[PDB]
């Protein structure tokens with residue numbers, strides 16, 4: 404395989420998709436690339452240029468400089484967060500705060516930092532509304548009013564990378580501290596077997612379920628422990644990352660039909676409490692490698708490789724007891740090449756490139772639409788039927804992962820590269 408040629412194809416396809424966004428959805432949150440229309444993501448009828456923001460670091464890394472600058476210039480002229488509407492704190496941080504930060508780090512443009520910080524200050528109100536510092540799920544961007552305290556580990560614990568970078572750049576430790584305090588809350592309440600339930604109440608500070616998970620509602624909490632060690636040298640986070648993964652390997656790792664899975668378990672007793680695994684769990688194969696459990700990470704990756712070989716597109720959810728789909732639609736999901744990149748950064752094994760190339764080519768074969776790339780309706784029909792949405796994360800995640808895996812671009816210091824859970828580059832840009 405000529406990896407450089409494949410990288411050039413990824414770049415060409417990304418530029419083509421960008422052109423569709425400009426033509427049909429300029430300044431809007433998401434393109435619906437089958438109909439050639441747009442939709443809002445955070446606040447209905449008050450778009451915040453989501454996909455444009457998500458795309459920026461990807462554009463820069465690919466050397467799509469005119470496109471990058473057009474997006475940055477749109478942000479500088481147009482993007483405001485003084486909006487009387489409710490935004491989901493978690494999504495707003497990982498997509499918009501993180502997307503502005505990566506664009507700031509690539510370009511050096513102070514305005515992008517000013518806007519990231521303005522947004523983080525609006526989100527901070529959600530943390531301040533809890534006596535525990537656990538953020539409420541929604542906040543009014545203008546007024547600070549909060550709603551829905553019945554939250555989860557991912558939505559209380561996927562801030563430290565973006566907030567910590569804000570603290571580094573601004574000099575104000577308050578961001579780092581607020582994010583770390585929320586994670587410490589649940590870690591301090593681990594069971595005797597070292598697990599946390601995934602569901603937590605922001606006001607009582609108590610768990611609201613008994614289910615420990617590595618999967619949706621928890622996932623990126625575990626990443627951000629490791630990532631805070633990597634980015635900030637935080638010794639507590641290093642310890643916690645390893646402890647949490649050790650507990651998961653002891654109590655959640657189970658084999659079904661010869662394949663490794665991590666079903667949900669009772670956080671105190673370790674009894675299996677669910678049989679589903681989502682596609683989104685594939686991130687964990689990469690995290691396992693990062694924390695020094697690479698053999699287990701490769702074993703887990705292999706479970707998803709099997710799903711890809713069997714089903715073409717990895718099912719959005721599977722039953723681990725049968726290895727078959729629980730849902731037929733998809734979200735055009737990036738977690739398989741996420742894992743491939745993260746494991747490849749350890750040893751540079753070309754196997755990961757081969758696996759990611761399958762994934763990219765399958766994306767082209769299934770999700771291509773008139774004006775971009777779309778999520779799927781039914782992976783079981785041939786052809787697979789399509790829905791009509793390009794999720795914002797596509798612009799930050801899988802095209803970037805493919806390009807990083809194939810390009811060996813001089814724009815990134817691969818030894819220093821750090822990616823958020825939304826693939827925002829938070830370290831490793833090499834000035835041109």
Ligand SMILES: O=C1NC[C@H](CO)[C@@H](O)[C@@H]1O
Pocket residue numbers: 555557558618619620621622623683
């Ligand atoms: O981002 C995704 N959907 C939202 C979940 C948190 O509620 C999160 O865990 C998942 O990765």
Ligand SMILES: O=C1NC[C@H](CO)[C@@H](O)[C@@H]1O
Pocket residue numbers: 497623683734736737738796824825826
């Ligand atoms: O961590 C998150 N999970 C869900 C999305 C990707 O599927 C994206 O928002 C991010 O990766």
Ligand SMILES: [Ca+2]
Pocket residue numbers: 623686823824825
């Ligand atoms: Ca992620």
Ligand SMILES: [Ca+2]
Pocket residue numbers: 626689745822823824
């Ligand atoms: Ca990660």
Ligand code: NA
Pocket residue numbers: 456457458459460461501502505798799826827828
């Ligand atoms: Na991005």
